[PDB]
Amino acid sequence: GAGPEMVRGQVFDVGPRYTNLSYIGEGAYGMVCSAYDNVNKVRVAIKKISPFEHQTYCQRTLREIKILLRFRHENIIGINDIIRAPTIEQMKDVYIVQDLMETDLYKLLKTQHLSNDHICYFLYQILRGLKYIHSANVLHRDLKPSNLLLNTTCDLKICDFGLARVAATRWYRAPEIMLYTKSIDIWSVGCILAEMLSNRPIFPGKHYLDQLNHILGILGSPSQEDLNCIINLKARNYLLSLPHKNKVPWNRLFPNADSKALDLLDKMLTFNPHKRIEVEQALAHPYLEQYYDPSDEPIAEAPFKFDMELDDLPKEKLKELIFEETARFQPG
Ligand SMILES: Fc1cccc(-c2cnoc2-c2c[nH]c3ncc(-c4ccncc4)cc23)c1F
């Protein structure tokens, strides 16, 4: 008996099945480690989640588990296993086990220059994965390079469905969020495409006002139609108080980019969410012609829906629902 496993002064109780732990990353209420699975004889990714002190954290944990266990797609991360305590009174943490990928798009863009063919293939896989998510009437709401996992052969998977809802990181947030619909994910994909083209975030604001200023600095001052929606009074009056800003052509920001990539980028980074390109039209765009294949782009059989009103349930009821949902991965 070795006792419970530990990583950087905190318990990571995944043994005896998962051993030889190595720290990967950390979040506000969760740590990610790689581990050796002695059953499948392969290294896996394990996320420790400690959400029971807050109702919102419990909601996100339950939403992610239910969505990922239901979803089955090549470009979406699956859940292989879930570890938690034998009794609800002892359950203070939840460990989700997933495939261990090589890296993420955040790390790849920090150290590698991407060829147009690699940008095209990654964009294709993101939209193919998004086509499946959106067909299930689910919004990811937090697409960004760190949520895009890559294997050695350049295959891509979308992860982190904690903020997903039935129909976030500031730099990839759609202007209407700051001013939610399926179109908010297309914006985020637009921001990721622009980042793949230059290895730099296109709208790197320090705060929400600086974010809007970064967006207007490239798209130009918004029109009357762009602003007239169910917009926040302060945000509207602020945008109206700003001096005129000229639109910066895409070929001026990305002078060495493929003209087809910039035409698609234009349609994804449209201020008005109603005029923004939808996932099926984006896949069919001439930029993705080499990879577009509607015969091999699966969709969800039916739209996703939660049986209960998760927002209204007390954290103690959500703790019970998490215990019940994770019971199928327990022995017996
Ligand atoms: F729910 C889970 C369960 C296990 C891990 C995660 C998670 C959260 N953020 O990335 C991951 C990863 C899942 N599989 C992975 N494989 C590799 C990497 C990784 C990232 C950066 N450098 C190297 C490896 C991350 C993950 C997760 F969301």
Curated annotation (Swiss-Prot):
Disulfide bonds: none annotated. Residues 234-252 bind DNA. The modification Phosphothreonine is found at T169. Phosphorylated upon KIT and FLT3 signaling. Undergoes regulatory phosphorylation on additional residues such as Ser-221 and Ser-223 in the kinase insert domain (KID) These phosphorylations, which are probably mediated by more than one kinase, are important for binding of MAPK1/ERK2 to importin-7 (IPO7) and its nuclear translocation. In addition, autophosphorylation of Thr-169 was shown to affect the subcellular localization of MAPK1/ERK2 as well. Ligand-activated ALK induces tyrosine phosphorylation. Keywords: Acetylation, Apoptosis, ATP-binding, Cell cycle, Cell junction, Cytoplasm, Cytoskeleton, Disease variant, DNA-binding, Host-virus interaction, Kinase, Membrane, Nucleotide-binding, Nucleus, Phosphoprotein, Repressor, Serine/threonine-protein kinase, Transcription, Transcription regulation, Transferase, Ubl conjugation. A motif (Nuclear translocation motif) lies at residues 302-308. Residues 18-288 form the Protein kinase domain. A motif (Cytoplasmic retention motif) lies at residues 293-297. One of its GO terms (biological process) is face development. Its cofactor is Mg(2+). SUPFAM superfamilies: Protein kinase-like (PK-like). It is linked to Noonan syndrome 13: A form of Noonan syndrome, a disease characterized by short stature, facial dysmorphic features such as hypertelorism, a downward eyeslant and low-set posteriorly rotated ears, and a high incidence of congenital heart defects and hypertrophic cardiomyopathy. Other features can include a short neck with webbing or redundancy of skin, deafness, motor delay, variable intellectual deficits, multiple skeletal defects, cryptorchidism, and bleeding diathesis. Serine/threonine kinase which acts as an essential component of the MAP kinase signal transduction pathway. MAPK1/ERK2 and MAPK3/ERK1 are the 2 MAPKs which play an important role in the MAPK/ERK cascade. They participate also in a signaling cascade initiated by activated KIT and KITLG/SCF. Depending on the cellular context, the MAPK/ERK cascade mediates diverse biological functions such as cell growth, adhesion, survival and differentiation through the regulation of transcription, translation, cytoskeletal rearrangements. Binds both upstream activators and downstream substrates in multimolecular complexes. This interaction inhibits its tyrosine-kinase activity. Interacts with ADAM15, ARHGEF2, ARRB2, DAPK1 (via death domain), HSF4, IER3, IPO7, NISCH, SGK1, and isoform 1 of NEK2. Interacts (via phosphorylated form) with TPR (via C-terminal region and phosphorylated form); the interaction requires dimerization of MAPK1/ERK2 and increases following EGF stimulation. Interacts with MAP2K1. Interacts with DUSP6. (Microbial infection) Interacts with HIV-1 Nef through its SH3 domain. This is Mitogen-activated protein kinase 1. The gene is MAPK1.
